């Protein structure tokens, strides 16, 4: 029942990775519980941003989230936020293993697909910026299979 | 150019077939301008299955609708609305060919897995509904490599 | 809900094309039941091909049947003997379109990969002959979303 | 050459990955021996079990594996139960790394869709146990070009 | 064997869809006999297309696949002129059926991402054209599951 | 940018595995420079496997490098010479991860299926050797969106 923010980055989108992305959590058998197409003001990215407004890159971080559209989910199941974290692979392009996220699509560290919360506090402020309106619920036909009780 | 109105019916998010359904469109070379996972609610859908309003099944389509969650989209490109309702298969999963969404995914008419805009004038219909607050707007890099001039 | 007889030919197993097939019939929403890896015997190949015993190349097709091991299913579903028959393409690899499996795979008549019962008659015929045991049953908890009411 | 035994649980074929599975043995190169649908026997179960007949949990793995049916499979090679649980995944679904079965698909270590053989002497008695009658022989064309001399 | 000239067109390359098009080849049974990544001449270009010299869209074939490297390739097989062009699509984007390269790629006309020869005869020319130095020879080791004796 | 050598071997031929590697380099976001299939020279051979001289399985090397052709590649990419390298997998199939070319492939030591450049010296190297004409130029249309400036 714990749920993570996943969110496709402007690189993601150009490079056609939205369904690929969406099937690695789905197959995984998460189930989502947020998710849109959205091109992001620049109030929006630096208060997302927030915890690094005092940085170098900070100027960078923004212009960049903004320079095209994303694509913002909300996955809920058991460790979806490490678990999420796994399946994208490490920070590092250069470091992420074959079977990753950016394993299989990123090679530059600025240009890594995509983002996950690296925490259940974390997700939890991601999920109230990006998601105001709240999660979309709905319980899975699948789910006595892939839970126990 | 052109846009068209495609929706994942709920059988088609309950059995985890949104990124594959994405996927295609995505490969064809359309540009996604709208997405969202949405509850529908019984109005609403009674306005999309307005046009059928008068048929002895319509509560029926109401009532399905609304059964699940569904996912909204918009997506662009020239005649992406036959090609559109081409990758989707005939309505019929009997006659649905394989290759198509319905071909390799659907068996009954009545779980038929996603919708296609039938029709250009059907389709400023159906996005103007689902999607009040227009298109997310952006250029796909290769787009000089799936378009001449 | 009717049953249908689907064969990977010796070849479809050296090929290594037994998980691609079984995938096809999973997506597409049917139920197996009936699965085992078998090497068919002289009389028992006699008795599939019986309705043949009357032609010239009849001494064929037991060789080749017995040849190598083959993979022996039950498939359960809504047209699944008309719908598999669709799935594998037609008989001439020459002709059978892209999309299907033997489109996608076969190349001559004597290689097509896979059999597939004709009909509904031939396949509660042949269902009987290869599985003499019967079927193994259990209903997929996604079942409300493959089929109605 | 060795053998190792693979079983896919009532959940796997529950969630339709049976083709999966498959595919991922095939493509490794290795050689299927055996496979068969079968819906387990709750006195078959205590004894596949048996060596846990004393841990608290038994009853449990024992209802469990009669709950659904199961796909029993022999395959064959070299390092094939150590590369078998190489690919399978780690056992807890909270570790095990994406590429890997359990790391693409499984969630719940209750729910782990598959099991393989943790070494040659127990896979002896895995395969004796679940395939009485032995494999079903043959030779890969390609073998001289999955293995030297 | 009859053998076929392939040519991935610079979009083809642009929009990394190599290896794809080599699969389903591959995946075909078909044998792989030459295969060259080309920054193709004006004057070949004009070689190339001189059965069509006089025609008004000459010139846009010319500046066409001299704008970007091609994958040039030589197929062998039974029929694998005419499945060759099956697997392609129809010309048009806008009609090719999905499954094939075109119908799961393509939408403009004119940036419809393969050539294949239309014909035993022109292949021939295209093939003594492109790889004047003759195909590369290897027989494969599943040819007896792919052919007949 | 770096450049390494990739050659996919005989096995990886004789196998149908030219498009599955292909795939993953080009899915990665590498730009491939270079590609061929060959059927290598005995003295050819031999200069490509210069610093096994002194060794004692050289000349085994070079007869399997010759008895069946190979495809050859040029790739470009930030780290492409160590991703490349991660991507193959480990030399040995029993250690290669899932993921991996080798981890998904491979078994047996001598037929590893693939080859890649050891650092970027041996790279300079080695696509000196095979590719004497030098690369073939062009600038992927996605390059702003895998590489940050």
Same mark, same amino acid.
């Given at each position: 029942?714990? +749920?993570?923010?996943?969110?496709?980055? &402007?690189?993601?989108? +150009?490079?056609g990775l939205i369904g690929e992305v969406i099937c690695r !959590?789905?197959?995984? =058998?998460?189930?989502?519980? =947020?998710?849109?197409?959205?091109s992001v003001e620049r109030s929006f990215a630096e208060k997302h941003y927030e915890d690094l407004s005092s940085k170098s !890159? !900070?100027?960078?971080?923004?212009?960049?989230?903004?320079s095209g559209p994303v694509v913002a989910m909300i996955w809920e199941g058991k460790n979806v936020v490490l678990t999420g974290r796994k399946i994208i692979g490490?920070?590092? &392009?250069?470091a992420s293993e074959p079977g990753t996220i950016?394993?299989?699509?990123?090679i530059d560290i600025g240009r890594?697909?995509?983002? =996950?919360?690296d925490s259940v506090e974390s997700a939890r402020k991601e999920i109230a910026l990006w998601f105001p309106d709240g999660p979309?619920?709905? +319980?899975?036909?699948?789910?006595?299979?892939v839970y126990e009780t």
């Open positions: 029942m714990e +749920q993570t923010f996943i969110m496709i980055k &402007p690189d993601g989108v +150009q490079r !959590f789905e197959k995984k =058998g998460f189930t989502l519980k =947020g998710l849109k197409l959205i !890159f !900070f100027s960078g971080l923004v212009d960049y989230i903004v490490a920070t590092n &392009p250069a950016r394993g299989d699509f990123a890594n697909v995509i983002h =996950g919360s979309v619920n709905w +319980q899975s036909s699948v789910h006595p299979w």
